[PDB]
Design a protein around this motif. Sequence first.
Motif, PDB file in Angstrom:
ATOM      1  N   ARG A  90      19.806  50.413  36.299  1.00 50.17           N
ATOM      2  CA  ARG A  90      18.908  50.628  37.410  1.00 50.17           C
ATOM      3  C   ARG A  90      19.148  49.422  38.329  1.00 50.17           C
ATOM      4  O   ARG A  90      18.410  49.194  39.262  1.00 50.17           O
ATOM      5  N   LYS A  91      20.202  48.650  38.110  1.00 52.80           N
ATOM      6  CA  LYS A  91      20.466  47.514  38.983  1.00 52.80           C
ATOM      7  C   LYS A  91      21.382  48.000  40.124  1.00 52.80           C
ATOM      8  O   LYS A  91      22.481  48.507  39.912  1.00 52.80           O
ATOM      9  N   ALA A  92      20.890  47.870  41.349  1.00 47.18           N
ATOM     10  CA  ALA A  92      21.613  48.344  42.510  1.00 47.18           C
ATOM     11  C   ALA A  92      22.787  47.520  43.022  1.00 47.18           C
ATOM     12  O   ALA A  92      23.759  48.099  43.438  1.00 47.18           O
ATOM     13  N   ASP A  93      22.727  46.194  43.019  1.00 47.77           N
ATOM     14  CA  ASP A  93      23.857  45.423  43.555  1.00 47.77           C
ATOM     15  C   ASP A  93      24.214  44.218  42.669  1.00 47.77           C
ATOM     16  O   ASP A  93      24.328  43.079  43.138  1.00 47.77           O
ATOM     17  N   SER A  94      24.419  44.466  41.382  1.00 54.78           N
ATOM     18  CA  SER A  94      24.745  43.363  40.490  1.00 54.78           C
ATOM     19  C   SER A  94      26.046  43.550  39.710  1.00 54.78           C
ATOM     20  O   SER A  94      26.480  44.667  39.443  1.00 54.78           O
ATOM     21  N   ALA A  95      26.672  42.450  39.343  1.00 54.99           N
ATOM     22  CA  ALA A  95      27.909  42.534  38.586  1.00 54.99           C
ATOM     23  C   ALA A  95      27.679  43.083  37.148  1.00 54.99           C
ATOM     24  O   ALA A  95      28.145  42.501  36.154  1.00 54.99           O
ATOM     25  N   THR A  96      27.004  44.224  37.049  1.00 60.14           N
ATOM     26  CA  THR A  96      26.707  44.803  35.752  1.00 60.14           C
ATOM     27  C   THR A  96      27.624  45.932  35.302  1.00 60.14           C
ATOM     28  O   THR A  96      27.527  46.422  34.171  1.00 60.14           O
ATOM     29  N   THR A  97      28.505  46.361  36.178  1.00 64.61           N
ATOM     30  CA  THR A  97      29.400  47.435  35.801  1.00 64.61           C
ATOM     31  C   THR A  97      30.836  46.919  35.675  1.00 64.61           C
ATOM     32  O   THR A  97      31.072  45.718  35.787  1.00 64.61           O
ATOM     33  N   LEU A 155      29.944  50.972  46.723  1.00 67.15           N
ATOM     34  CA  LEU A 155      28.592  51.431  46.389  1.00 67.15           C
ATOM     35  C   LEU A 155      28.411  51.647  44.878  1.00 67.15           C
ATOM     36  O   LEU A 155      29.251  52.287  44.236  1.00 67.15           O
ATOM     37  N   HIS A 156      27.338  51.098  44.308  1.00 59.70           N
ATOM     38  CA  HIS A 156      27.004  51.282  42.891  1.00 59.70           C
ATOM     39  C   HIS A 156      26.740  52.786  42.727  1.00 59.70           C
ATOM     40  O   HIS A 156      26.280  53.448  43.656  1.00 59.70           O
ATOM     41  N   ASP A 157      27.002  53.352  41.559  1.00 63.00           N
ATOM     42  CA  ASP A 157      26.764  54.780  41.417  1.00 63.00           C
ATOM     43  C   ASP A 157      25.325  55.230  41.809  1.00 63.00           C
ATOM     44  O   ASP A 157      25.150  56.276  42.423  1.00 63.00           O
TER      45      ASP A 157
HETATM   46 MG   LIG Z   1      24.363  46.039  39.073  1.00 65.33          MG
END
Ligand SMILES: [Mg+2]
Length: 485
Positions: A228-235, A345-347
Amino acid sequence: CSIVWFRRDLRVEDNPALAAAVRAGPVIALFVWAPEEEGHYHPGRVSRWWLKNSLAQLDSSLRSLGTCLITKRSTDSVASLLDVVKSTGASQIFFNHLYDPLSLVRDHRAKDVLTAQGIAVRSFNADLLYEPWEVTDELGRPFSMFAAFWERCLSMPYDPESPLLPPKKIISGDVSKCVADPLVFEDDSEKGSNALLARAWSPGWSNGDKALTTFINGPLLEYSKNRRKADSATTSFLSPHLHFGEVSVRKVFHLVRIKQVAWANEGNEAGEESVNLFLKSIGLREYSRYISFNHPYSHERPLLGHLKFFPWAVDENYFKAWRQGRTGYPLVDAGMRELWATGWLHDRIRVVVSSFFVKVLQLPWRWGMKYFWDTLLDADLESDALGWQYITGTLPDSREFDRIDNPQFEGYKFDPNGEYVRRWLPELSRLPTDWIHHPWNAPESVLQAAGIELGSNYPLPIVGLDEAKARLHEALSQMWQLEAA
Ligand SMILES: [Mg+2]
Ligand SMILES: Cc1cc2nc3c(=O)[nH]c(=O)nc-3n(C[C@H](O)[C@H](O)[C@H](O)COP(=O)(O)OP(=O)(O)OC[C@H]3O[C@@H](n4cnc5c(N)ncnc54)[C@H](O)[C@@H]3O)c2cc1C
Ligand SMILES: Nc1ncnc2c1ncn2[C@@H]1O[C@H](COP(=O)(O)OP(=O)(O)NP(=O)(O)O)[C@@H](O)[C@H]1O
Ligand SMILES: CC[N+](C)(C)CCCS(=O)(=O)[O-]
Ligand SMILES: [Cl-]
Ligand SMILES: [Mg+2]
Ligand SMILES: [Mg+2]
Ligand SMILES: [Mg+2]
């Protein structure tokens, strides 16, 4: 002389065509740039910027191994092949498959002309875990929904081929051909707009490997609790690399499968869950190829026809407002801004903005598909079509069509403290969290203090949600009435 025809498999590791060519005799690494042959979908500016740098790294790599990459600019790739064989004296051409509509045809036309001209043509799987024909139900028919398809992919009687090492050496047939056609991927206008990309991305297989490593050894553990993180280096950030075959999904799958076994053993629940969601992500990409192959006009023709007589709004300025990020809903406008400025864009935001596009503005999904294809750094026909069809509701497994998401609530879910909206909308950079996802309500004093003048530097909702649900209904009443005929 054996010819290796590179298209969207820009790597030397686990590349079956290349490995088959090195086994056979010297090689001529070829890449042919023929965009007009791509129709309405020639590659966009940021995709091209990626290709340009990815090819340089590919050539650099091949040189390290002994041969150069020969590039040809033309209007017909097949023809170019012929003129290359009929100039080099090659007898075989090795290439890896592609499953998008435009590629499907040209590839057949390729095999025909070349084989029917005395050339052996062999074809391998470089982009999928399994060819779409290897994955089928007990009767033998193609699955019609993701879950059933993915469950079969994960429970197959055999494993995906394991990543092969790149060659250790390559011998190059006619090196006098190294100095070939220069490829121009940027006009001066575009060079300007591409200037920040090198700061954020490193195109090429070497860097893709690096990203895969980084991801698996870091963020994958929290992949699940972080989406649910929109703009983070999580993917993973592997999509642009994946689109040009810079990284092998088979290698990706193998590394993920090893981590999963280690985490199951440890009884680390977060890990397993994250592994499952990430594999579902790889699964969706594999499924986009499946659908494109089993429905060859999927990039324009929808699978379900239940929305056939739906009266889609064809409003040009609704479109412009969407593209400009002038819709009035912060999270939707932030996404359009980040997309326009960065090609990324994040998914979740992709879902949020494409969903608003079909349910609130009610524009034709082919238009959103095309805009995405021209602006995304990972523009991919199969993944772009699959996403748009799924959001619009023309897929067997799409969510209920008569449902409109509220950007204000999506805002609360994905951007709880307004950090995402404020990063991409400087006009809203001074608005407090209580109104960040619905500024049109806000007391005049908060707007005045934040410098926001509704209708000027930030628009009012271009279409209200209530008014939106109503046109949606009025539109259904109409298509149902049209059905009666
Ligand atoms: Mg993120
Ligand atoms: C309307 C819409 C349009 C899209 N257009 C594209 C596109 O043009 N090109 C593209 O590659 N993806 C597209 N996607 C899917 C997805 O958003 C991107 O693949 C993903 O955001 C890329 O980020 P990542 O590499 O960090 O993905 P991760 O979450 O790290 O997942 C790893 C890989 O799984 C694959 N993947 C993940 N989610 C999806 C998905 N929903 N569909 C297909 N593959 C997926 C991608 O190859 C991704 O790189 C679209 C999704 C939607 C809803
Ligand atoms: N059947 C499908 N076909 C194509 N794409 C799909 C499909 N299902 C999901 N997707 C894609 O994957 C995304 C996530 O799937 P979804 O079923 O919404 O679970 P989720 O996003 O994790 N839901 P949530 O746990 O509330 O965040 C969707 O938003 C699409 O981008
Ligand atoms: C946050 C992900 N960023 C850093 C932007 C892209 C990853 C760099 S790359 O091009 O090596 O994958
Ligand atoms: Cl319906
Ligand atoms: Mg990297
Ligand atoms: Mg995330
Ligand atoms: Mg969901």
